[PDB]
Tab-separated table of C-alpha atoms in Angstrom:
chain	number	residue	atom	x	y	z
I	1	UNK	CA	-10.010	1.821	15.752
I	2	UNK	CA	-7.186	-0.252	15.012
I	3	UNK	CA	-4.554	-1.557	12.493
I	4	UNK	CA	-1.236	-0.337	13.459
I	5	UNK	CA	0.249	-3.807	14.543
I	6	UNK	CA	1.797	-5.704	11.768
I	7	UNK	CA	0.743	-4.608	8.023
I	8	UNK	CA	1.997	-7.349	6.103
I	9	UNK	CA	0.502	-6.991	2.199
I	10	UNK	CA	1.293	-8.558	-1.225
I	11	UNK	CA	0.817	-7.775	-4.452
I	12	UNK	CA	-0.277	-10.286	-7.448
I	13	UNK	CA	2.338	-8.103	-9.819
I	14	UNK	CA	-0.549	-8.514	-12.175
I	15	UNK	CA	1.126	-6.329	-14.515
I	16	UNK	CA	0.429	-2.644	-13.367
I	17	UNK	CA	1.281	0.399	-15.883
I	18	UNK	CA	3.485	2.657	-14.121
I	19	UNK	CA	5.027	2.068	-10.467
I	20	UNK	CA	8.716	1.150	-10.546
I	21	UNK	CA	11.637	3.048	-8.955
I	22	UNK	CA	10.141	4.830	-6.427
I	23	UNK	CA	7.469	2.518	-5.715
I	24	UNK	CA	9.649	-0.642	-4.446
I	25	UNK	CA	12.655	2.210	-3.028
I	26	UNK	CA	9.883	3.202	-0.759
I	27	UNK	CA	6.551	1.547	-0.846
I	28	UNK	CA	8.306	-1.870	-1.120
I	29	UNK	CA	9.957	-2.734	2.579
I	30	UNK	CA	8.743	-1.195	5.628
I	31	UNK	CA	7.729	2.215	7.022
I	32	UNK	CA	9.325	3.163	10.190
I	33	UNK	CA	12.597	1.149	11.476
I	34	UNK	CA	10.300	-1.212	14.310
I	35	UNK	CA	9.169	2.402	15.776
I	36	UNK	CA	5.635	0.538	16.988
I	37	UNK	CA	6.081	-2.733	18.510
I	38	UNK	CA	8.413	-3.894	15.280
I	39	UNK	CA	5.072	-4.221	13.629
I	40	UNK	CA	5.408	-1.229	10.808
I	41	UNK	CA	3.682	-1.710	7.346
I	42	UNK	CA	5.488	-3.925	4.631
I	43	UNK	CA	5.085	-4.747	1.295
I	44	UNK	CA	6.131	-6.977	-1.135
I	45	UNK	CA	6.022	-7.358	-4.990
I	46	UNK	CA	5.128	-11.095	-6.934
I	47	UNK	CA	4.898	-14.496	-5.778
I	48	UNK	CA	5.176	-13.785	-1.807
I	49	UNK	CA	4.259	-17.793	-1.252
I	50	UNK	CA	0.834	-16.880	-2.185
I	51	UNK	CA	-0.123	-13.157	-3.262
I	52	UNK	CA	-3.947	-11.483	-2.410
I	53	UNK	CA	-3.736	-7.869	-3.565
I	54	UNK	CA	-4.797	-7.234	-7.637
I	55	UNK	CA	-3.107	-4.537	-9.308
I	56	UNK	CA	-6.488	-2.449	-10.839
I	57	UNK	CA	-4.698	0.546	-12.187
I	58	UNK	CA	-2.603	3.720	-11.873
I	59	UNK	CA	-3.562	7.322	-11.409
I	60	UNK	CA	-1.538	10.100	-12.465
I	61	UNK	CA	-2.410	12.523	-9.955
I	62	UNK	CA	-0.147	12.170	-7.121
I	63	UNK	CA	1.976	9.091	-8.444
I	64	UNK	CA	-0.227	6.245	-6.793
I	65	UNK	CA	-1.949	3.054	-7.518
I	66	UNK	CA	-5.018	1.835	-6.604
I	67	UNK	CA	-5.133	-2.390	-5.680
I	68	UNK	CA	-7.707	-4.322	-4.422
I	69	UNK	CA	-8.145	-7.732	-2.281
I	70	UNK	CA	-9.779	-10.895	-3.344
I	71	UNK	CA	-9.154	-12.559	-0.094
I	72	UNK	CA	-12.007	-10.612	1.648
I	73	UNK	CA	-15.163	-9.788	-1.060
I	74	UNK	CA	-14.126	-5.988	-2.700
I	75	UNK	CA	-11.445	-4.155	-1.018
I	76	UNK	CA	-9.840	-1.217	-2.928
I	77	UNK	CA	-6.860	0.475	-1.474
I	78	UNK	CA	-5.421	4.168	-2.696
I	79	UNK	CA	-2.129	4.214	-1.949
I	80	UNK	CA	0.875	6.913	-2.589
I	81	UNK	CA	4.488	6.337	-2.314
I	82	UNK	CA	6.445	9.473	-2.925
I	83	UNK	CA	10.213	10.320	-1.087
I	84	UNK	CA	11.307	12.607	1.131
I	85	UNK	CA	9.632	10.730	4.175
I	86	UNK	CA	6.192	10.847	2.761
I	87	UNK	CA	2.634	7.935	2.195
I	88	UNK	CA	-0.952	7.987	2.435
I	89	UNK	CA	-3.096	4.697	2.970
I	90	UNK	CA	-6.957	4.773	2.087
I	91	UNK	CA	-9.265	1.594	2.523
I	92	UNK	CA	-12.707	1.503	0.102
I	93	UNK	CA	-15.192	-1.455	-0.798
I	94	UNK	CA	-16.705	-2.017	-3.804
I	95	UNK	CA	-19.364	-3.691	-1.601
I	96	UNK	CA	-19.305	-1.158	1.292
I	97	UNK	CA	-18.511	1.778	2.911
I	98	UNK	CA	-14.715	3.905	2.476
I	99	UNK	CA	-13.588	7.298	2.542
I	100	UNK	CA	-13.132	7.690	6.195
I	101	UNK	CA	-9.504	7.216	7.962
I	102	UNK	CA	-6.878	8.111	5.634
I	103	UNK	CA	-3.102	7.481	7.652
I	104	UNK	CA	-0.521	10.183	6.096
I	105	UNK	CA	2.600	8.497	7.821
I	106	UNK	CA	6.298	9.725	6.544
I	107	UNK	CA	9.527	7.695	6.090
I	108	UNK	CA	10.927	8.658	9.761
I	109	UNK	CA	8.652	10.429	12.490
């Protein structure tokens, strides 16, 4: 449909469990240096003059963590932030339906 033109998210930094180095070295900034319309997908950690995103948990299987948005109704987001030029994006609703783009974009290209 649509959705890459300026992804601007925030976390709550309601804690978490693991998510740390990696996480704000990649995850934490933007993906691609303005290489769409210098609208690229950044995100920040805490406070953010008002955050959205809750930190639900971490999973183990391919070092990612899974948030979701109050500022909508139920929206869960799966989420990995690698290196070597690497993230996947996945939007669910705990309300609705999921499961059905998935954007596996890498640091560069």
């Amino acid at each position: 449909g649509s959705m890459e033109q300026f992804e601007l998210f925030s976390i709550d930094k309601f804690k978490c469990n693991s998510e740390a180095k990696y996480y704000l070295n990649i995850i934490e900034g933007e993906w691609h240096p303005q290489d769409l319309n210098d609208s690229p997908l950044k995100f920040i950690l805490s406070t953010s003059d008002d955050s959205d995103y809750i930190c639900k948990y971490i999973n183990t299987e391919h070092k990612q963590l899974t948030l979701y948005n109050k500022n909508n109704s139920s929206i869960v987001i799966e989420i990995f932030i690698p290196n070597d030029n690497k993230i996947l994006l996945t939007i669910m609703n705990t309300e609705a339906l999921g499961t059905s783009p998935r954007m596996t974009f890498i640091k560069h290209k």
